[PDB]
Design a binder for this molecule. Structure first.
Ligand SMILES: *[C@@H]1O[C@H](CO)[C@@H](O[C@@H]2O[C@H](CO)[C@@H](O)[C@H](O)[C@H]2NC(C)=O)[C@H](O)[C@H]1NC(C)=O
Ligand SMILES: *[C@@H]1O[C@H](CO)[C@@H](O[C@@H]2O[C@H](CO)[C@@H](O)[C@H](O)[C@H]2NC(C)=O)[C@H](O)[C@H]1NC(C)=O
Ligand SMILES: *[C@@H]1O[C@H](CO)[C@@H](O[C@@H]2O[C@H](CO)[C@@H](O)[C@H](O)[C@H]2NC(C)=O)[C@H](O)[C@H]1NC(C)=O
Ligand SMILES: *[C@@H]1O[C@H](CO)[C@@H](O[C@@H]2O[C@H](CO)[C@@H](O)[C@H](O)[C@H]2NC(C)=O)[C@H](O)[C@H]1NC(C)=O
Ligand SMILES: *[C@@H]1O[C@H](CO)[C@@H](O[C@@H]2O[C@H](CO)[C@@H](O)[C@H](O)[C@H]2NC(C)=O)[C@H](O)[C@H]1NC(C)=O
Ligand SMILES: *[C@@H]1O[C@H](CO)[C@@H](O)[C@H](O)[C@H]1NC(C)=O
Ligand SMILES: *[C@@H]1O[C@H](CO)[C@@H](O)[C@H](O)[C@H]1NC(C)=O
Ligand SMILES: *[C@@H]1O[C@H](CO)[C@@H](O)[C@H](O)[C@H]1NC(C)=O
Ligand SMILES: *[C@H]1O[C@H](CO)[C@@H](O)[C@H](O)[C@@H]1O
Ligand SMILES: *[C@H]1O[C@H](CO)[C@@H](O)[C@H](O)[C@@H]1O
Ligand SMILES: *[C@H]1O[C@H](CO)[C@@H](O)[C@H](O)[C@@H]1O
Lengths: 543, 542
């Protein structure tokens, strides 16, 4: 094999090696596979409001679930894969950065996907969102191609379609190739090797999969991704002229460039009939918060600064006027490379569809020390947004009561803000309009302390996740019928409990429970999976 | 008090003493007291169903909250109080029986009650259910009376009525006088001194408060209480001829006798005009479970056995044919003293009102080794009900899915089983009829891991407690209109996070938060309090 791949894994496995799952072969779904019995008939009573009686989502609405390669696959060294930065991080700093977990095995989706798909068909899911592992295709990020990796996703996609799941592919879901980080700092690249290497990678997967996959996302949540570049292991190999503050905005630029160029390739492939016609964009996240004090001009300014730094910095170069928002430029200056007119030519209009991972909406309080004073000082704790960013403010009205129900406190950013969904959608489609509409591409619940339950029946009756999924879907439905939002789909994070980055398998986002103390990693439906099923039975067109 | 009060407390305090609250004086409520602001107006949407639109509880419905003296009061040693078995238990075995808590202070309701009552008025509560501390009235259980104790409840009752809360009094809520346990084993008394001592106590409080308190319960959950008598500190002082197993049914016998004789005294005081005419009963708890497999005769029999040991053993002697359930006698034998003809003269019909602490409904799986094999073997883990008692059975259908949402795993007996309320009330009113009707005398939610929250806004939006209280109230409202249940009130446990017995202040049951890290133990409304308030506004006659 490759000597530099072997060396990279050696580097990763130096304190401790990759562990292997109990099951390392593709599973066979017996024709007789017995699904666990339904919950009692009264279980779903009361979640659905009569406000939505009879309403349907548009024909062709993608009613789906979402995962991510490194979060669900496992098989971290299988069939020629190369390490990502996360494989390195959690094998060297698991105790302080990865909650003592690693993504070696996670849910073993890499080998269990046929069974997972069969279980999704049981619920009536019609769409399967996944991401491709870059280092399964190019184990060193650039150079040679790993055919076994390419063939693996052919099989996944084929299996998904067999079970009635339309496949939606994300190109990059945060799993940066270790090789590229070491060689030139990956997304910190002061030149443009990263764009070229991402373009080569994306081209390859478009060509290999574009006939089967007709909805593409280049990047999952690039703003959240680039904010992680401020830390380990990225800041072991910063290129000179880059530090942990500029690294965030050098990542932003390089990511916008990579997305624009990839999109040009994709459109060339569609326009030439090389691959099936399809649509492409990226997944935004976060929200335009409501001001803590209505009609307070400082709170409105910090709210706008929140949207600018959290959504606008990517959305406006793509769906906007082609530049970064004016407030972002006035605050970060030379740390955020200007978009040359060549840059803008690739990036403006490079979004056929918008997608918002709309987990929640926040509340903005202007910095207590004054916004002007805060934006001058890169060391102020509320820089650059210059709202009070801590939880006692970001979720709390002047009343001291919260905007809504909190989830697990290890993911304290997550709240149930369903009544605010429609205004988020209105703002986004009027501000970042895309010819192909908007997906609600990720939303899900981390039930408080679900990881501390020991008995299955206590886990599976998951009220607040059931409530959150139902509430959010209801507002999506109403957004279509009452606001005329061109809503294309709804993808819940996630169909299984999975490896939640720094929190590892502790944090539980699935509408199915994964038994991590069982060698087979048995899935079990939670009540929320059945609530999702019932909602699609009631509010999808089936004729 | 006597030197015997000093000796008993010296015994209780032998390893570490009773701690004192930062505030040791009765608080006064400033006229400008500022309640915290309301939740957003969308916060309560969607909880109430249309099934109940326009429906109202009967006129005079008691719409209230419940506490118990030792769970909320604190002031464990103040104003002459004597120690209870729990004061001893948690000052001596705290790390193994009390979760390293004790009831020295709890919520400091003993000094804070005027403020608590102002906050309950702001919610439109109209009924306050409370228990009287026996050892505040008789510090030794028997003998001398502590006048400062009697005067304290005079002022509590007066403050309650002033804030528009009808006072509902429980004579005994588990706080056994330590002196009586050392002297003759308290409720394990193989004679009848425990009955005399309880009756003298009940008399004293009936006379003192019966003009202001018109709804009385002798005992809170006597089945649960008596099950504690199998353990510490009660099993350090069993009389000869009593063991951890018979202590439960000796307790059961004496409580029934104490109840009958106390009710007798209650009626004589009413007949003679010494006190206002009211109603007395006791609070049952638990449920008649559904069988795991419907139509399975084994599951149906173990379900009946459950009701017999959990409800029938107190309810049948009082509200039914006046004897213990047959299955109870057949299984327990001479451990359960027979009810004499005289006994029955006091006990039978001694219940003007039924009260059920209707937290939950269970599922009954017949014992897997077979009911016949289990009833004959006191060593069997499932004796005497001879259903599978463990959590993976008591809450789970054969399907593997639960009957309902679980609450916090440290109180796993609690689930949300609102769909089953109307059936429970049908069974109870048809089987244990009371002229005065039935109270839903306790129900509430322990929000999972609420104790691990560190920011207040995360505590107060308490979705599953809010859902639970609304689900339960809704079904209660339907029991009145669709089933014709003479439901006399609904008292939720509890108005404050408080001292939850062996879990101490860790388990959270209040629709208000209590800040145990704050010297003033400040209260904050959770969303559930506002949900309770709004249900009262929508569904009480005014
Ligand atoms: C590189 O980024 C990491 C973030 O992972 C920084 O880690 C911080 O280290 C400081 C040292 O005092 C701690 O106070 C912080 O708590 C750490 N942050 C986190 C989130 O772990 C690290 O300091 C950075 N190093 C350099 C060279 O800038
Ligand atoms: C990280 O890099 C940035 C940019 O080089 C530093 O921020 C600058 O600090 C200089 C002080 O010489 C300011 O006058 C510049 O205006 C700041 N940058 C810009 C362009 O806004 C930052 O301090 C660097 N070092 C850290 C954060 O350790
Ligand atoms: C998770 O799976 C494990 C293993 O399949 C289940 O636990 C085992 O149950 C047996 C009972 O026969 C115990 O004696 C074993 O010790 C358990 N195995 C362990 C702990 O590794 C368990 O029931 C499942 N958990 C849930 C919540 O479904
Ligand atoms: C008195 O009752 C207590 C209950 O608090 C009993 O405590 C048990 O002790 C046994 C033996 O060590 C343990 O196996 C149990 O786990 C304890 N039960 C608890 C604390 O849940 C004690 O055994 C009883 N003493 C006598 C004399 O029977
Ligand atoms: C506690 O005392 C009771 C009193 O009966 C004991 O119950 C008896 O147990 C013996 C042997 O197991 C049986 O032969 C009798 O039939 C039982 N009596 C009754 C009335 O059923 C019980 O065994 C004692 N338990 C302990 C632990 O002391
Ligand atoms: C910048 O913020 C840091 C942290 O609040 C503070 O110590 C420092 O004084 C600030 N500097 C200025 C110029 O405000
Ligand atoms: C009674 O139950 C125990 C379980 O504690 C068991 O070991 C024993 O065999 C059973 N039967 C008897 C004692 O006849
Ligand atoms: C409890 O009180 C302490 C001290 O007053 C306070 O600092 C803390 O924030 C409070 N905790 C809450 C409200 O959860
Ligand atoms: C377990 O086996 C896998 C192959 O499936 C290896 O990649 C891993 O290093 C471990 O030996
Ligand atoms: C998958 O991989 C493991 C080693 O990694 C083997 O033991 C297993 O039989 C299968 O080949
Ligand atoms: C793949 O195939 C192996 C047999 O080599 C099984 O053991 C495994 O469970 C999976 O089906």
């Amino acid at each position: 094999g490759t000597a530099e791949l072997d060396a990279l894994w050696n580097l990763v496995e130096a304190q401790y090696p990759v562990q292997t799952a109990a099951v390392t072969t593709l599973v066979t779904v017996p024709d007789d596979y017995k699904f666990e019995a339904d919950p009692p008939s009264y279980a779903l009573a009361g979640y659905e409001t009569s406000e939505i009686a009879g309403l349907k989502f548009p024909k062709g609405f993608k009613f789906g679930v979402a995962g991510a390669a490194i979060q669900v696959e496992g098989a971290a060294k299988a069939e020629g894969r190369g390490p990502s930065t996360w494989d390195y991080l959690c094998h060297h700093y698991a105790s302080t950065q990865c909650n003592n977990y690693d993504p070696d095995i996670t849910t073993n989706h890499y080998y269990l996907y046929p069974l997972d798909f069969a279980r999704l068909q049981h619920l009536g899911i019609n769409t399967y969102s996944f991401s491709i592992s870059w280092t399964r295709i190019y184990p060193l990020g650039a150079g040679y191609v790993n055919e076994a990796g390419l063939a693996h996703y052919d099989a996944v996609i084929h299996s998904a379609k067999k079970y009635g799941l339309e496949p939606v592919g994300t190109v990059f879901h945060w799993d940066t190739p270790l090789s590229l980080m070491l060689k030139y700092g990956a997304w910190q690249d002061t030149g443009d090797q990263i764009v070229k290497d991402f373009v080569t990678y994306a081209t390859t997967v478009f060509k290999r999969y574009g006939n089967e996959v007709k909805t593409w996302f280049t990047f999952n949540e690039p703003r959240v991704f680039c904010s992680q570049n401020s830390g380990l292991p990225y800041n072991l190999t910063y290129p000179e002229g880059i530090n942990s503050t500029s690294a965030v905005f050098r990542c932003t630029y390089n990511v916008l460039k990579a997305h624009g160029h990839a999109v040009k390739v994709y459109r060339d492939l569609v326009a030439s009939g090389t691959i099936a016609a399809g649509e492409i964009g990226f997944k935004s996240d976060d929200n335009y918060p409501i001001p803590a004090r209505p009609g307070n001009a400082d709170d409105e300014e910090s709210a706008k600064r929140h949207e600018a730094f959290r959504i606008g910095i990517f959305a406006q170069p793509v769906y906007g006027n082609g530049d970064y928002p004016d407030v972002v430029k006035e605050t970060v200056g030379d740390m955020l490379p200007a978009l040359t007119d060549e840059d803008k030519g690739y990036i403006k209009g490079s979004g056929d569809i918008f997608a918002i991972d709309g987990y929640r909406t926040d509340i903005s309080h202007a910095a207590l020390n004054g916004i002007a004073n805060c934006i001058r000082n890169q060391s102020d704790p509320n820089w650059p947004v210059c709202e009070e960013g801590s939880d006692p403010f970001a979720h709390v009205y002047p009343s001291g009561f919260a905007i809504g129900q909190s989830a697990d406190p290890l993911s304290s950013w997550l709240v149930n803000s369903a009544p605010f969904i429609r205004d988020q959608l209105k703002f986004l489609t009027q501000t970042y309009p895309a010819k192909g509409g908007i997906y609600f591409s990720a939303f899900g619940w981390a039930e408080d302390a679900e990881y501390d339950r020991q008995l299955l029946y206590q886990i599976t009756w998951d009220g607040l996740r059931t409530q959150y999924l139902t509430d959010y879907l209801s507002q999506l439905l109403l957004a279509v019928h009452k606001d005329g939002i061109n809503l294309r789909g709804a993808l819940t994070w996630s169909f299984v409990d999975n490896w939640e980055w720094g929190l590892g398998m502790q944090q539980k986002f699935g509408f199915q429970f994964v038994n991590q103390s069982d060698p087979d990693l048995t899935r079990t439906f939670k009540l929320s999976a059945h609530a999702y099923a019932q909602f699609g039975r009631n509010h999808l067109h089936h004729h």
